[PDB]
Design an enzyme around this catalytic site. Structure first.
Site, short mmCIF file in Angstrom:
data_model
loop_
_atom_site.label_atom_id
_atom_site.label_comp_id
_atom_site.label_asym_id
_atom_site.label_seq_id
_atom_site.Cartn_x
_atom_site.Cartn_y
_atom_site.Cartn_z
N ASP A 162 43.30 51.28 35.84
CA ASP A 162 41.99 50.94 36.38
C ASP A 162 41.46 52.06 37.27
O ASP A 162 41.70 53.23 36.99
CB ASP A 162 42.06 49.63 37.18
CG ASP A 162 40.76 48.84 37.15
OD1 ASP A 162 39.77 49.27 37.76
OD2 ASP A 162 40.75 47.74 36.54
N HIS B 255 37.65 47.96 42.11
CA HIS B 255 38.05 47.13 40.93
C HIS B 255 39.59 47.14 40.76
O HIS B 255 40.19 46.12 40.64
CB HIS B 255 37.34 47.69 39.71
CG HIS B 255 36.68 46.67 38.87
ND1 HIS B 255 37.33 45.62 38.38
CD2 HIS B 255 35.42 46.60 38.38
CE1 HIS B 255 36.57 44.91 37.60
NE2 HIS B 255 35.36 45.49 37.58
N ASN C 212 32.77 41.23 28.50
CA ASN C 212 31.79 40.40 29.21
C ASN C 212 30.42 40.41 28.55
O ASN C 212 29.38 40.48 29.22
CB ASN C 212 31.69 40.86 30.67
CG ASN C 212 33.05 40.94 31.34
OD1 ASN C 212 33.89 40.08 31.14
ND2 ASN C 212 33.28 41.99 32.12
N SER D 293 37.54 40.86 33.19
CA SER D 293 38.36 41.79 33.96
C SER D 293 39.17 41.07 35.04
O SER D 293 40.28 41.51 35.35
CB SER D 293 37.45 42.83 34.62
OG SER D 293 36.24 42.20 35.00
#
Ligand SMILES: [Ca+2]
Ligand SMILES: [Ca+2]
Length: 279
Positions: free
Chosen positions: A39, A69, A161, A224
């Site tokens: 990430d 994130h 998403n 996520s």
């Protein structure tokens, strides 16, 4: 063990019904397992990681998480207050820049890195990788995910998403990994979550509270967010000896809460991750 007033998603994966607030879990808590978070990086100095996190690789100028994130999703894997597997070891691999973007060539290199680096780490109960990223279909990215899984790492990836079929996104569309959809606290599919026959499992993904950079916390939504619940659950179940990296996704689907979710289109699994904990 039981954590009272837990974030809703932790409570949800320890219960057969929505609306509870206690997270019940076995004290082993993923000790002896390792989870790579691929990430934006991890703010390893966050007190919630208790020294159990470290950065092992970056593809940019610094190893710092300048985005948040990666610190968020690592916290859902294994932070003390917000994590599923509260004693696991976390390794950060920074393949995304601080704006949250990354080239596919860098993402692929990061997965190949993990397949080899795990051979240098002491992870007696097994190895998991959590990828809360995705983009358009790429057979090269799918192949890199398949390689990581084949090498002996339980790979969990976000479905995406887009409120669309996950078959057009990577690495979500690679069949050999664990593709994770998102649900909300009322057991509805999250309105943004992708769907399709390539999904393996759902996990909590709307309004997920976890760690953030600057030693802070914040609540955010996405598939996520759902993915690290499943990655943490796998590490938790491998430490208990119930499953292995090669079969953990199947075991989680076998033992999930079945039929609980609403707004699941025909052809998508109605399975919600569940730890089956009995005191
Ligand atoms: Ca139920
Ligand atoms: Ca799969």
């Amino acid at each position: 063990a039981a954590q009272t007033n837990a974030p809703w998603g932790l409570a949800r994966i320890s219960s057969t019904s929505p609306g509870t607030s206690t997270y019940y879990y076995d004290e082993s808590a993923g000790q002896g397992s390792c989870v790579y978070v691929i990430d934006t990086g991890i703010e390893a100095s966050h007190p919630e990681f208790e020294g159990r996190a470290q950065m092992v690789k970056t593809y940019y100028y610094s190893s710092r998480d300048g985005n948040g994130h990666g610190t968020h999703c690592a916290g859902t894997v294994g932070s003390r207050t917000y994590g599923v597997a509260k004693k696991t070891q976390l390794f950060g691999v920074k393949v995304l820049d601080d704006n949250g973007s990354g080239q596919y060539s860098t993402i692929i290199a990061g997965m190949d890195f993990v397949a080899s680096d795990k051979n240098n780490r002491n992870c007696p109960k097994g190895v998991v990788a959590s990828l809360s990223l995705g983009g358009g279909y790429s057979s090269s990215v799918n192949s890199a995910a398949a390689r990581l899984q084949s090498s002996g790492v339980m790979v969990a990836v976000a479905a995406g998403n887009n409120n669309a079929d996950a078959r057009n996104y990577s690495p979500a569309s690679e069949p050999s990994v664990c593709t994770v959809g998102a649900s909300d606290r009322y057991d509805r599919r999250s309105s943004f979550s992708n769907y399709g026959s390539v999904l393996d499992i759902f996990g909590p993904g709307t309004d997920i509270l976890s760690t953030w950079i600057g030693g802070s916390t914040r609540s955010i939504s996405g598939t996520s967010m759902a993915t690290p619940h499943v990655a943490g659950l796998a590490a938790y179940l491998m430490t208990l000896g119930k499953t292995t990296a090669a079969s953990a996704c199947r075991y989680i689907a076998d033992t999930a809460n079945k039929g609980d979710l609403s707004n699941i289109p025909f052809g998508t699994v109605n399975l919600l991750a569940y730890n089956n904990y009995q005191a």
